[PDB]
Amino acid sequence: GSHMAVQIGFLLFPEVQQLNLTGPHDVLASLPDVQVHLIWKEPGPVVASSGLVLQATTSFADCPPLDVICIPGGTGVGALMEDPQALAFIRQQAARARYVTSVCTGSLVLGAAGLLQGKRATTHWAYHELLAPLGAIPVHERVVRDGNLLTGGGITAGIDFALTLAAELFDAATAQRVQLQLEYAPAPPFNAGSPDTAPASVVQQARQRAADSLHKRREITLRAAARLAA
């Protein structure tokens, strides 16, 4: 241990999209003197949306004050957006955190917690329209900073997000060393990572596959928004 150790905490909830957590985890855990916490109601196993089992290391109650709080996205976001225990924890940690952050649909949770009002932010492309009712000003960029808020786009944007955050916590040379250790020189075999470049038939397939979830999440978002409006 060190008096100056940086405390980084990820919310780990059932039906998280695990890459939203595990991509950033590997970038940030590599940084000098960092301790990374995986936070839920109690320590123990938590099942991600793929069926991969992750393990929370601390409860909300025992989590130390965080220098960075990060909300990963996933199917489980809808429940979180109306989880008073989780939202209260997020607001409490955000009061003093150096950085308040999210990846993918985790920004919808920051929105439900009241932390995006009047702020520019992004989220997963398929849910991007849900930012505005939460008070955010939506921006279509992969990593969006507004003061001490940092939000990443959909799933794999967590890697770009975390390297950006690494340079802010330390410096460019440190982020570059991590990027090289991860051999992060991506060369995607297709050009379908954005709805603006993917084949139109693939975009339609993706939207159809997401329509039921988007409908349910919109209902949740509007209830969360009405709470903020009152």
Add this chain to the structure above:
Amino acid sequence: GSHMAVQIGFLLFPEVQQLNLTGPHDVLASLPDVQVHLIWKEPGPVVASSGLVLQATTSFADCPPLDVICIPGGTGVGALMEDPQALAFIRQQAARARYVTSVCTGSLVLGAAGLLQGKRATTHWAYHELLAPLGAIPVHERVVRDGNLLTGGGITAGIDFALTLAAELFDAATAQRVQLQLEYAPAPPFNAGSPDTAPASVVQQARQRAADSLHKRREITLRAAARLAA
């Protein structure tokens, strides 16, 4: 129990580099009609090199016959390269698997198992010189295919590897749909992901940080290579 599901297995071992497993796992588990296994000597918790805890779903003995075997890399591969039980599992699965695969330094395990003799393969850039003593034809590319062998480069190459494998298992349109769902249109904040583009100062800092591991792994590699004589 979808009977025609592709059976995909990752070796999950102590001191795995978790992102070598969790990146490809999230890609492949998104495919239709697949079942993904995490295999170790027994089911239960397995701690990755960063301290992230993962959970093996099956023992070697209980694992079904796999269509795809995938060996992730990590600090723990040195032990695997001389682990007779793990090597026997790999060899028996590879004897009939439709695809034999690895990410990062997992190809050194395939090499120790005798499965790269005369075969084109890659690995993490910092360990690439360990391929030739194991009989491989070392190839400086991010994803290398040689018959039913498919190997990926260091850590984050797992995502590009897995999308390539997804198109082989299914088709391009299916792999594109997963790419879009993962929003995998990378925009790295630095250009240091390869030793060819990173600043030379950064390459030196990465090489020095890897030096003790490389020393240990070279000794193991030369013992494993001599055992390939018969």
